[PDB]
Design a protein around this nucleic acid. Structure first.
Length: 40
DNA sequence: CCATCAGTGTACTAGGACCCGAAAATTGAGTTACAGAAGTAACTGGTATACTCTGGTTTCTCTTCA
């Protein structure tokens, strides 16, 4: 349990926003552009 | 008295720089090739600003004819 608490502390140190999920919610991890437009 | 018309007390913008961290990219050493281009590291002339007797000059008494 204590080592799990330590690992939780470390994943807190290694945790990270909401702007990244704005208008183009989906986006490449390469280029960072959304998918093409719908037909709608 | 119901029109009108500043202020007001705020969260909600509007610019406006600015910062924090993460992730990607680079740098760096190690080897060994490869060809050629930089990149200093070296000896070796070449011509002018002082420079040092020196050749001429200049009166100034004198030398030598005349």
């Amino acid at each position: 349990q204590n080592r799990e608490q330590q690992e939780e502390l470390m994943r807190d140190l290694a945790g990270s926003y909401m702007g990244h999920f704005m208008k183009p919610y989906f986006k490449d991890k390469v280029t960072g552009v959304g998918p093409p437009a719908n037909e709608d």
